């Protein structure tokens, strides 16, 4: 849900960077291409993708990381910052200042407008506002009842009249009525049409002149991908007070293309629709959105990994109970150590452990599993095969025998 | 590479459990079905999958977790333990005791036998052994040269004669020759055939009687999935000293079906092949393998998550520099706190923060982004909308103003 | 959309059988394995899959094709009839005979029940019947206006009272009322429940008060094989029970749900197919299974012809290039392989020999036959293992067809 | 296997054009968008994709189809010729004219060079030529025995010395020797390099000593669009350069590599296709692009016919069910829709009206036409908006076909 695949793909290019052995020009070129592929696949206009990834390439190649910041962390920064501007740079909230603050909603059939009208009403009501909705949708009068269905539970008033045929008349009667009732916010649901043709924009100019809304909000179906550009653009040109809600971002392969498309337009995206239910709407705040997108600041994720690790306890416990009965092997030790040195942030020491591994990599399975069998000629083979001395080998073995004695002789009443 | 998809799918059922709200019978039934799907998809025989998931279901449903172990952690344990037995229970290494320890390799064309012969020779040489290989493959005499190609770099002797036509003669001349040269280990590469027919098993019984190997090793192509069963079984019945290497597990959708199939047979799997290169072989140790498979003990993973998190530093840094100039918002605070309480393992307190969130969820975007605008009537709306008091609301705001004053007045010389 | 990939997976096992070189026992084991994989992935209960897939294996291993039928064609027939029986075997339509034929609809929240009430009203209305729906759904009010929303444009009476709190009362009142206005069919939408529990099935009350001709449980198909226990409990609790399975569109587990329900014997009357009023189709197992496996696809065959003709311009440019005397052995080799499928001129054995010869020519030779020396013809006959006579034969046939094209005129359609 | 999904993605855009209701400008924008997506996903350089995909858009928006060609067929022709030029335009085979025609093979480690040396020797040998390969690969010895391994069963002379440490010396010695034994073609395998750097291209040395007829760089196709810089650097450094791209089988980025190389103009002579000695095919852009897009698929059309006939048993059981007088309106409706595609009896407008009527019948009515009352016929004509006369018409046609079947005998094949 919500750009979804695009998220994973973008985050992975950033992980790759974090994990990269070093930052050369080849790393960048791959990053840029990883991003082009992810973007294009989410239906982002090709020209837009080129422009963005050429800026990212450029900034990475020729920009010195500020003091105490690696080339690597600065790349992560460049990508985050470029993507954020690519989706509108910053939040542009809806201001509620005027008394009845009037929001006029426009959109074609199947944009998800009716539903979005309910979502927006509920968003505001949840936050202590009195809301009235006015249904002036004469194009599919079933909308009055659909709004009743979505909104009655919340006692949010829905003014309508499935038996009125003048669209502008309807919108004015409604606004005046709900305005009489004392509301803070009025949301006006206008008639859809099949496409966003001249008729539709003309009808919005007319309804807007008559009711004088605080804001006109075009609802765009985000599954149309980059085709949202021209729809947003025509709208943004027919109204000095326009904003956009983009719906159906959940699961859609193409929502990325819609957001980037609308943002290329200048028009402000204020909310996104996120599913079919009344609460499935979230305000759009580019830097925060792009941050969830890229998997940044994932402290929750880190905690899940810890928790998951801890639930492995009965397994670890039985491992240890095996050690207590002396069933402890060179493989078990190999691992104990391996974990110890991968724990920063009976201790061997980094170099000595690095040597210890090298020695065991020259042992056979049967030796790792039954050290007891490791006689002297074996030791001289192990030493020869690992490029170390028979001394080192007997050292490692001593360490093993030491740790083995420990476990074999343990309280049988503890917890590691 | 290596069961790959099956790994991710199995690990996810275990993650689901770790994350589950509670452990009821419905959770189990879903786990079992998640595992059937993963298994069947990797070509594990259906009857085998039924038997395994019925045991897992049973143990989960009717088994009490030992003292101090949750139902949840005990399920994780049951799954790990069942899967481990399903793939052979424990390591059965190859013992090198006899002087020339002789390993006789059998397999059909395209099993990856020739390559596996080199991998096994190199595995042993790397570990300080003198190795000789004897190529008695009269069925595709190009094999002598292929072995030379793989093995010359290591100075591992390859006895052969692309111009000898008696297979058993060849294998005996070779063994005697390489035996004269002083080797610890001799690997004998017999002639393949098209399928594993009676001819092939008969020819192995004959060659085995003549050379008297320490072990006979059948090389099975793991991309055949569950069809490995009958091949392993026929072999295991034609020799009291048989083991198995399963090749091409890397990337293959069906290797899971091969391992489970061979293990159902009783025959010991000693190594797996892992790719085309000479080092692409690993010993098979069921509990360790099933442990990597299920993503258990992933301390490395945890460390990667930390490292990745740290590379986000230039971003966090610029966030903070915004706070220093007083550009700090209710959203920024909302987050600071949210992270603080998700950090165990200026502090508010769990209940107070839970209340704080509830209040902000009743604020609008413009309020969260510009607290300054929050006059008194707004506060009474916020308080009403959050089901709290105007006192609580002014409390939260005070906390905000406090934290805001802090940042606005900071050294501009530190690091958070 | 509906059972999408399950369909393709099954359809492919049949193509593989049609395409099979010969029908040994290993072709049956691969078919049986391929089917188990497709079914398990659609969330079919694994025990069911064994049961179905074993019978298919047996029937195919130990059954002699009737007279004039190959082993291949009988395997196809086996797979098709087993899947048909697997999914219910035969259609069991709703019977409208009584005046107010009354349908009681039950379901848990989110199963798609309320939408389904509407789709079904529309189904009948569209066919000439007068329909009225009684909304006795007191559990999630909003259901009443949802039915208004969906149904008003069809002037289908919707009786309800979003203020009535008694479910039995509302149902009784509504049925009586709608029955007054002389409707042929009454569909009653009952109150949902969070889950299908003793509370839900305890529908018996309403059913005992309104005496429905039929009681339809609406099941969300995305639950997959979990539909089994749900349909079973419901079928146990009523002698007059039928099922509608919804949300089959795009569903990964729809397969599992249909087979789950059918393994219960409760009849599947319709399937839901989308969110819109028309996304409902009556269920008819053999028709369904035939579309599923892509059987009798004349439409498919036609499309392929259409598409092949659309290539006309390209074909015509190739030919214009021949009239200009640019016509290679490559082009010829293709024209022949082509002609050996113009059915349903040179022959089938002479063509077979011509191939073999060209397969010993190099790329420059195939592309510039003009350059073919005398020694080259020796190299070729030698490499192809044929007589230089064979080689010069082919080269003549070439020279023929060539000049033939060179001396056509642009009146070539 | 080779360019797998790229092929399907492109082939589908053409099916969509063939299937298009009408050809407006939005059908071109979707085609152009669909192509950009397929190409970008195959790792084609994005700037190339713009360039190609813009030209395709223009040529289609502002070009009038020649006489007798529809807009549709011209779009198909456009897509096909652009992709062809995109991938090299026309075949450029290796020319064997000189006695020892000498081929110098270069490549970096893992590009598949040594295998490719062998596949190519085999390619020629198989066609009658005497071939000898000189292994001057001092960088990864093992290459010599690899060539022995691959080549001995063909008695293709392999000259080498895994002990010789001088690359130029070994090449010179080997060429001279092999040339003595009277080989038509000599293939020289040069030492690889970790990467294609000044060191690698500084091949000029060997080329100046043995004077090859041609120098072939072997490129690993899985590097995708990174092939461009590699082919460019190499082509700059030699007037006689050709490319072989390997590892195209299963490759996700093979597309990107072919277009990368072709945008350089260096001729692509062969492609590698697998690990085996026979997995090499000469590259011929128009042939390649035609297979890619699935053009001229007669084989495809045949397969579909074959598969449809294999359904005979099922068809025959359906019919046996008719002879028993079990033949519904469902069956009839199907027999008719069917017959309206028996081309290429009732008519096309009478059938159109029959549909409409049945579409107002319920499932019990379609399945038990016997039950169709007098009032039912009113309900139906009313719901279908036709005359009860129309309804009884259809019902007659039914009754006809029915008894007709009922009175066939089991001599029905
Ligand atoms: N998945 C999803 N569906 C949505 C969203 N918004 C609206 N829809 C659905 O889109 C369809 C049409 O929207 P609706 O408001 O009902 O009608 P409209 O006013 O004509 O566009 C309905 O099926 C809605 O459930 C969304 O954000 N996500
Ligand atoms: N990917 C992969 N390929 C393998 C493995 N083992 C062998 N192969 C390949 O399988 C093919 C045939 O195996 P090979 O040893 O060369 O011939 P054989 O003795 O006839 O089976 C070669 O292409 C090998 O590279 C493996 O573990 N992984
Ligand atoms: N895709 C799909 N969605 C459906 C189908 N039937 C119902 N739905 C959706 O399921 C959701 C819940 O169904 P609804 O009738 O509204 O509510 P219910 O009575 O509580 O189940 C609604 O969004 C419907 O649009 C179907 O057949 N296919
Ligand atoms: N799939 C595939 N693999 C190939 C192809 N050509 C070569 N290879 C493999 O690439 C690997 C390296 O090629 P090779 O000729 O052995 O070594 P090189 O000379 O160092 O490139 C070998 O495993 C080959 O089997 C090809 O066309 N397709």
Residue numbers in the entry:
A (entry chain A), B (entry chain A): 1 to 345, 365 to 435
C (entry chain B), D (entry chain B): 1 to 202, 204 to 345, 366 to 434
Q: Can you provide the manuscript's text about this entry?
A:
Our structure of Pfu-SRP54 is the first full-length SRP54 structure bound to GDP. The protein interacts with the nucleotide through an intricate network of hydrogen bonds involving residues from the conserved motifs I, II, IV and V. The paired hydrogen bonds between the carboxylate group of Asp250 in motif IV and the N1 and N2- nitrogens of the guanine ring are canonical nucleotide-specificity determinant seen in all SRP-GTPases. In particular, the sidechains from glutamate Glu276 and Lys248 in motif IV sandwich the guanine and ribose moieties of GDP. Lys113 sidechain from the P-loop sits between the carboxylate headgroups of aspartates Asp137 (motif II) and Asp189 (motif III) near the β-phosphate of the GDP but does not interact with the GDP. The catalytic Asp137 is located 6.6 Å away from the β-phosphate of the GDP. Despite the presence of magnesium in the crystallization liquour there is no clear sign of magnesium ion bound next to the GDP molecule. The M domain of Pyrococcus furiosus appears as a stable and well-defined structural module with the exception of the finger loop (residues L346 to D363) that was not observed in the electron density maps. A groove flanked by helices α10, α11 and α14 and the finger loop constitutes the putative signal sequence binding site. Pfu-SRP54 appears as a flexible molecule with a stable though dynamic M domain articulated on a flexible linker that connects it to the NG catalytic core.
